[PDB]
Design an enzyme around this catalytic site. Sequence first.
Site, PDB file in Angstrom:
ATOM      1  N   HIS A 127     141.542 -23.857 -28.345  1.00  0.00           N
ATOM      2  CA  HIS A 127     141.900 -24.875 -29.489  1.00  0.00           C
ATOM      3  C   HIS A 127     143.557 -24.977 -29.812  1.00  0.00           C
ATOM      4  O   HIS A 127     143.747 -25.797 -30.602  1.00  0.00           O
ATOM      5  CB  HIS A 127     141.110 -24.400 -30.755  1.00  0.00           C
ATOM      6  CG  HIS A 127     139.719 -24.439 -30.737  1.00  0.00           C
ATOM      7  ND1 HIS A 127     138.820 -24.026 -31.641  1.00  0.00           N
ATOM      8  CD2 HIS A 127     138.873 -24.800 -29.468  1.00  0.00           C
ATOM      9  CE1 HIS A 127     137.574 -23.958 -31.197  1.00  0.00           C
ATOM     10  NE2 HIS A 127     137.642 -24.688 -29.928  1.00  0.00           N
ATOM     11  N   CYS A 171     163.673 -31.795 -16.243  1.00  0.00           N
ATOM     12  CA  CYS A 171     162.535 -32.604 -16.136  1.00  0.00           C
ATOM     13  C   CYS A 171     162.560 -33.708 -17.479  1.00  0.00           C
ATOM     14  O   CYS A 171     162.204 -34.934 -17.267  1.00  0.00           O
ATOM     15  CB  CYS A 171     161.283 -31.848 -16.649  1.00  0.00           C
ATOM     16  SG  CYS A 171     159.774 -32.855 -17.026  1.00  0.00           S
TER      17      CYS A 171
HETATM   18  N1  LIG Z   1     136.648  -8.798 -40.840  1.00  0.00           N
HETATM   19  C1  LIG Z   1     135.480  -9.413 -40.309  1.00  0.00           C
HETATM   20  N2  LIG Z   1     134.547  -8.906 -39.464  1.00  0.00           N
HETATM   21  C2  LIG Z   1     133.571  -9.652 -39.286  1.00  0.00           C
HETATM   22  N3  LIG Z   1     133.337 -10.789 -39.371  1.00  0.00           N
HETATM   23  C3  LIG Z   1     134.230 -11.407 -39.921  1.00  0.00           C
HETATM   24  C4  LIG Z   1     135.394 -11.093 -40.561  1.00  0.00           C
HETATM   25  N4  LIG Z   1     136.011 -11.753 -41.243  1.00  0.00           N
HETATM   26  C5  LIG Z   1     135.340 -13.013 -41.098  1.00  0.00           C
HETATM   27  N5  LIG Z   1     134.213 -12.826 -40.374  1.00  0.00           N
HETATM   28  C6  LIG Z   1     133.445 -13.696 -39.973  1.00  0.00           C
HETATM   29  O1  LIG Z   1     134.074 -14.504 -38.944  1.00  0.00           O
HETATM   30  C7  LIG Z   1     133.397 -15.913 -38.681  1.00  0.00           C
HETATM   31  C8  LIG Z   1     134.587 -16.865 -38.522  1.00  0.00           C
HETATM   32  O2  LIG Z   1     133.809 -18.001 -38.361  1.00  0.00           O
HETATM   33  P1  LIG Z   1     134.644 -19.590 -38.460  1.00  0.00           P
HETATM   34  O3  LIG Z   1     135.346 -19.405 -39.809  1.00  0.00           O
HETATM   35  O4  LIG Z   1     133.650 -20.698 -38.213  1.00  0.00           O
HETATM   36  O5  LIG Z   1     135.735 -19.361 -37.618  1.00  0.00           O
HETATM   37  P2  LIG Z   1     135.697 -19.628 -35.975  1.00  0.00           P
HETATM   38  O6  LIG Z   1     136.667 -19.180 -35.183  1.00  0.00           O
HETATM   39  O7  LIG Z   1     134.057 -19.398 -35.366  1.00  0.00           O
HETATM   40  O8  LIG Z   1     135.764 -21.337 -35.767  1.00  0.00           O
HETATM   41  C9  LIG Z   1     135.799 -22.296 -35.007  1.00  0.00           C
HETATM   42  C10 LIG Z   1     136.942 -23.234 -35.046  1.00  0.00           C
HETATM   43  O9  LIG Z   1     136.464 -24.131 -36.275  1.00  0.00           O
HETATM   44  C11 LIG Z   1     137.441 -24.586 -37.015  1.00  0.00           C
HETATM   45  O10 LIG Z   1     137.238 -25.861 -37.153  1.00  0.00           O
HETATM   46  C12 LIG Z   1     138.821 -24.159 -36.009  1.00  0.00           C
HETATM   47  O11 LIG Z   1     139.216 -25.073 -35.098  1.00  0.00           O
HETATM   48  C13 LIG Z   1     138.177 -23.321 -35.367  1.00  0.00           C
HETATM   49  O12 LIG Z   1     139.165 -22.721 -34.160  1.00  0.00           O
HETATM   50  C14 LIG Z   1     132.620 -16.053 -40.134  1.00  0.00           C
HETATM   51  O13 LIG Z   1     131.413 -16.586 -39.647  1.00  0.00           O
HETATM   52  C15 LIG Z   1     132.787 -14.864 -40.961  1.00  0.00           C
HETATM   53  O14 LIG Z   1     131.449 -14.300 -41.430  1.00  0.00           O
HETATM   54 ZN   LIG Z   2     158.512 -31.133 -18.148  1.00  0.00          ZN
END
Ligand SMILES: Nc1ncnc2c1ncn2[C@@H]1O[C@H](COP(=O)(O)OP(=O)(O)OC[C@H]2O[C@H](O)[C@H](O)[C@@H]2O)[C@@H](O)[C@H]1O
Ligand SMILES: [Zn+2]
Length: 293
Positions: A127, A171
């Site tokens: 991303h 470039c």
């Molecule tokens: N300390 C922890 N330990 C375990 N789980 C955790 C903790 N802290 C948070 N969580 C969980 O961590 C999870 C994080 O889920 P999300 O928040 O959807 O992030 P993504 O990386 O999947 O999001 C993807 C893309 O969406 C966006 O638009 C951006 O573009 C992102 O790049 C949650 O379900 C929490 O419960």
């Molecule tokens: Zn270049």
Amino acid sequence: AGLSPYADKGKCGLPEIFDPPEELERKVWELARLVWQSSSVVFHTGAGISTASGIPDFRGPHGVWTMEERGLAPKFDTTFESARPTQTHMALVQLERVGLLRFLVSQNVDGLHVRSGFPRDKLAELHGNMFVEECAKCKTQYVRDTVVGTMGLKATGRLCTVAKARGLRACRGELRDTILDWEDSLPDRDLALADEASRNADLSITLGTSLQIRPSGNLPLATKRRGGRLVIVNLQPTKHDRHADLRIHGYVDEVMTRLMKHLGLEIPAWDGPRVLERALPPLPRPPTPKLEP
Ligand SMILES: Nc1ncnc2c1ncn2[C@@H]1O[C@H](COP(=O)(O)OP(=O)(O)OC[C@H]2O[C@H](O)[C@H](O)[C@@H]2O)[C@@H](O)[C@H]1O
Ligand SMILES: [Zn+2]
């Protein structure tokens, strides 16, 4: 957030789950055997592995999109430049050093995997990375020390400096950020490496991602598709819970600390930002782990 307004942010603010201690203990031992025995281990990381550094997630109870549904701004306890790699970040550095990790696929834009010292040639940043700009003409990337200053694939104001015409000039192509906006195509190079690693893994482990974005969230399923094993480590439910062979609800730092302990490996200390382009040759395969009582 300085990226486009967008309706479909997925399911936000679901409740967290904590496996009870007996069950958690058994599960992490199982994870340790799996990592030890498998020929090709791929980790998939999301925003949950950076919450302990003070960077909010997106869809957790205090997530950026969760708070946005109630008009609020999220709380940032650090800036991207001042954020420190977590124990999970550094555990992944060490697993890679000792040959227990084949590839790392990340959805995080926070730049912490690179800054922790993880080698770029074993990393897909699906991303973007706030610290990385790319030349629109020749595709050379620059890993900066400080955030490049734009998001959504805009021009940063800098020009490409890679020598051209027998070194009689640069470039001069336009550098643009790598942070994808909503519905942008994923970086070709990174996605192809990530899909190849997943397609050929015998073990995929997801850490702190709700797996709601496609295609990024579907990559671990390619492992399951060829008969490899899928592990999901997350506090909330994930989209693909029904496909996991092993499901661990707990703090990702707790899981990874216990895992490293079961493998007989120390989590190294971070000593400030690094950039490692190519993986060193591995350290010796660690002593054979002791098994569960
Ligand atoms: N300390 C922890 N330990 C375990 N789980 C955790 C903790 N802290 C948070 N969580 C969980 O961590 C999870 C994080 O889920 P999300 O928040 O959807 O992030 P993504 O990386 O999947 O999001 C993807 C893309 O969406 C966006 O638009 C951006 O573009 C992102 O790049 C949650 O379900 C929490 O419960
Ligand atoms: Zn270049």
